Amino acid sequence: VLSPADKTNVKAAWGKVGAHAGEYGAEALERMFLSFPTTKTYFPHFDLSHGSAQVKGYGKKVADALTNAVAHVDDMPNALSALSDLHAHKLRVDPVNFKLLSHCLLVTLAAHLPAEFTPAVHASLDKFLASVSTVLTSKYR
Amino acid sequence: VLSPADKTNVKAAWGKVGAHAGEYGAEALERMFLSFPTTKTYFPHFDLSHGSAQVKGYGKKVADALTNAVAHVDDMPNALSALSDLHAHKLRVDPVNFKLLSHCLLVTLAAHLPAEFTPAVHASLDKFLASVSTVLTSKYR
Amino acid sequence: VHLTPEEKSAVTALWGKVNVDEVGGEALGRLLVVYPWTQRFFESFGDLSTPDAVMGNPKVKAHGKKVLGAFSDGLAHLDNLKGTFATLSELHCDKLHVDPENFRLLGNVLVCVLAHHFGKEFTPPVQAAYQKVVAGVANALAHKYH
Amino acid sequence: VHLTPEEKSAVTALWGKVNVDEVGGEALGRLLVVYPWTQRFFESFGDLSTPDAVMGNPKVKAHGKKVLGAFSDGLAHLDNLKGTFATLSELHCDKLHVDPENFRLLGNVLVCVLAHHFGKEFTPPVQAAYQKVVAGVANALAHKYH
Ligand code: HEM
Ligand code: HEM
Numbered sequence: 325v326l327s328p329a330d331k332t333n334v335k336a337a338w339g340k341v342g343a344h345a346g347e348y349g350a351e352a353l354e355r356m357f358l359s360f361p362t363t364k365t366y367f368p369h370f371d372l373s374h375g376s377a378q379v380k381g382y383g384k385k386v387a388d389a390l391t392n393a394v395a396h397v398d399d400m401p402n403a404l405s406a407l408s409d410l411h412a413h414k415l416r417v418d419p420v421n422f423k424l425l426s427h428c429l430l431v432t433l434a435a436h437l438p439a440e441f442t443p444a445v446h447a448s449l450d451k452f453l454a455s456v457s458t459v460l461t462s463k464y465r
Numbered sequence: 466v467l468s469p470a471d472k473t474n475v476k477a478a479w480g481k482v483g484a485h486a487g488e489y490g491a492e493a494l495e496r497m498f499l500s501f502p503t504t505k506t507y508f509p510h511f512d513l514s515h516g517s518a519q520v521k522g523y524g525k526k527v528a529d530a531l532t533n534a535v536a537h538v539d540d541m542p543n544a545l546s547a548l549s550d551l552h553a554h555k556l557r558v559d560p561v562n563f564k565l566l567s568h569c570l571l572v573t574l575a576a577h578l579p580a581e582f583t584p585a586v587h588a589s590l591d592k593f594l595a596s597v598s599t600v601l602t603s604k605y606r
Numbered sequence: 607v608h609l610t611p612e613e614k615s616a617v618t619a620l621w622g623k624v625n626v627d628e629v630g631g632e633a634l635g636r637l638l639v640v641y642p643w644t645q646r647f648f649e650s651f652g653d654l655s656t657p658d659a660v661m662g663n664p665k666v667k668a669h670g671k672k673v674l675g676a677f678s679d680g681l682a683h684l685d686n687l688k689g690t691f692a693t694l695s696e697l698h699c700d701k702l703h704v705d706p707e708n709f710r711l712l713g714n715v716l717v718c719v720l721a722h723h724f725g726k727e728f729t730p731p732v733q734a735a736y737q738k739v740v741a742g743v744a745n746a747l748a749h750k751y752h
Numbered sequence: 753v754h755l756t757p758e759e760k761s762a763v764t765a766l767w768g769k770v771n772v773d774e775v776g777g778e779a780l781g782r783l784l785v786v787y788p789w790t791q792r793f794f795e796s797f798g799d800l801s802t803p804d805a806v807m808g809n810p811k812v813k814a815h816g817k818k819v820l821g822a823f824s825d826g827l828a829h830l831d832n833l834k835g836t837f838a839t840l841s842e843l844h845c846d847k848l849h850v851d852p853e854n855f856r857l858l859g860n861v862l863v864c865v866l867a868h869h870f871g872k873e874f875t876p877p878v879q880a881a882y883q884k885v886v887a888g889v890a891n892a893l894a895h896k897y898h
């Protein structure tokens with residue numbers, strides 16, 4: 325469960341991200357595809373080169389979903405319901421990959437938030453990304 | 466979530482375990498300690514040899530907790546509340562190990578109850594054990 | 607992965623008793639039932655709508671037999687699983703785009719099928735040896751991903 | 753794990769700028785804050801119940817310095833991580849009873865600490881090299897478990 329402090333920490337960190345959310349989403353994906361090449365198996369229809377339009381566009385979609393989750397941190401299952409349906413019934417990504425993307429999102433935030441990425445905020449962001457991942461895999465079976 | 470069919474399947478399969486619950490729990494633990502030796506790091510105070518009294522007694526505890534969870538499948542978080550407190554605050558087993566024990570419980574049930582272990586029941590049991598594991602790690606952080 | 611000589615003997619003895627016509631389809635079928643998101647890779651296989659449809663699907667049975675034959679190749683070359691599976695690793699990555707995590711799921715389903723099929727004979731030490739085998743097969747099948 | 757010459761160069765160049773007195777305590781502290789069940793191994797450190805208590809704890813800092821010193825030793829032997837860490841692997845298994853899954857968590861946090869400290873210089877290719885390193889160290893530390 326996300327605590328009151330977790331929610332404060334996540335909202336503050338995401339507020340600092342600001343207009344860079346989509347850029348950071350794309351960077352996290354690039355980090356994931358390079359560090360964890362098995363994740364590329366889900367994107368055989370993408371140009372995965374650095375700076376590709378498809379990775380930029382998809383990173384913005386990931387970022388917007390995370391922003392939606394932050395804005396609805398009190399009831400994420402309801403806010404992410406349509407996206408969780410799409411993951412369960414169509415995308416069908418193995419759950420382990422959510423931990424890989426979550427780690428790469430943390431690395432990206434760490435690399436861009438020198439003051440904000442304190443130990444407490446790191447812990448809260450990890451819990452938040454795990455909670456999002458749990459919602460997105462909640463309808464798999 | 467566990468569907469009505471899942472709950473029916475789990476109650477029937479675990480009901481056939483019956484008075485063997487403790488023996489089957491000890492066997493599942495032995496399977497886990499031999500197949501996944503890193504799990505032994507949680508039991509340095511145990512004699513882990515085949516047939517040891519401590520493994521038998523601990524297997525009964527695991528099995529009885531599972532029987533209680535089956536009996537309370539409609540409200541498992543409440544039924545397991547004290548046990549999840551103990552796991553989060555004292556035992557502190559890394560979450561990966563719950564999947565190892567769950568797999569070894571399935572193997573034990575498959576080896577002992579072939580008429581019960583149909584594909585549908587296998588699926589329901591795997592969901593149930595994952596759900597128990599989720600409850601037991603729900604208070605970790 | 608390294609099996610002891612005793613483990614190699616035990617895995618070989620049990621495998622000689624495996625019904626090569628059923629076990630592969632049972633493991634693949636159970637993968638698709640227990641982890642239904644894995645059906646994404648088999649849309650061309652037809653009806654996968656219920657457990658009975660999955661287990662009875664002739665394409666699941668036929669493909670499971672091919673998977674089992676590859677497992678048999680690995681059991682005949684336990685000291686070189688990497689080389690045994692290198693071509694299939696490249697295929698599953700480059701042509702089929704299969705996340706290797708699925709190999710671990712299938713391996714543990716296969717262990718459950720072996721336990722179901724062999725009962726008391728699938729002892730805890732025999733299981734531990736087969737866990738080494740399925741982990742080694744999964745690692746070898748993953749090795750050529752990039 | 754084996755690293756290409758370019759990855760080795762990138763790892764060594766970044767590590768030459770890592771502060772030996774600081775990064776280890778920061779990584780160990782973040783491990784204990786982010787994954788608080790890991791505190792089970794460190795009762796003798798005293799209060800670990802808040803981020804401030806963990807991060808300022810002098811035993812966390814002193815121990816983290818030793819952990820990262822051993823990590824530094826591994827970076828001098830990247831082709832022989834299993835041999836280099838065999839004695840420490842035996843210690844963590846036989847004396848300390850540490851589940852090796854924790855080694856992967858510490859690697860996670862160390863990568864985050866390097867990214868936090870270095871910022872943009874911790875590029876996606878540099879991270880990928882360090883992911884190979886931390887996986888190799890974790891695997892080496894797990895290797896003598898039995
Ligand atoms: C925090 C975790 C994640 C979030 C918030 C997220 C979000 C999204 C969103 C918003 C979409 C577009 C949905 C739509 O079209 O309506 C999408 C699509 C997709 N997701 Fe992600 N996702 C996550 C994790 C993952 C992971 C871990 C993978 C695989 C490694 C993945 C693979 C895909 C794929 C393949 C698509 C389809 C993209 C396309 O064809 O354009 N997702 N996801
Ligand atoms: C289905 C999952 C599990 C169930 C239902 C379960 C149940 C239990 C129960 C009922 C107890 C005794 C609680 C008490 O004293 O009141 C216990 C203790 C314990 N559990 Fe398990 N557990 C599970 C998974 C695990 C796993 C995966 C591990 C580690 C690999 C583990 C390690 C321990 C340890 C070390 C103890 C203390 C034993 C002792 O000191 O006597 N548990 N568990």
Ligand code: HEM
Nearest residue numbers: 644647648672673676677694702704708709712713744747
């Ligand atoms: C883990 C052990 C596995 C082995 C030994 C194995 C082996 C094989 C073999 C021998 C083939 C046929 C190659 C050919 O005809 O040239 C094949 C094809 C295929 N495999 Fe695997 N496989 C394994 C796991 C998986 C898993 C877990 C999945 C997906 C969840 C998968 C997905 C596929 C697909 C989609 C094909 C092509 C099927 C078709 O032609 O319609 N494989 N595999």
Ligand code: HEM
Nearest residue numbers: 790793794796818819822823840848850854855858889893
């Ligand atoms: C890259 C990973 C790691 C390295 C290189 C490492 C290295 C070391 C070293 C050099 C020591 C001192 C040994 C001695 O004094 O003889 C030590 C002790 C210890 N390590 Fe690790 N370690 C790692 C990860 C971990 C993790 C993840 C945990 C637990 C979550 C852990 C738990 C311990 C404990 C409990 C001690 C003993 C501390 C004490 O005496 O109070 N280690 N480690």
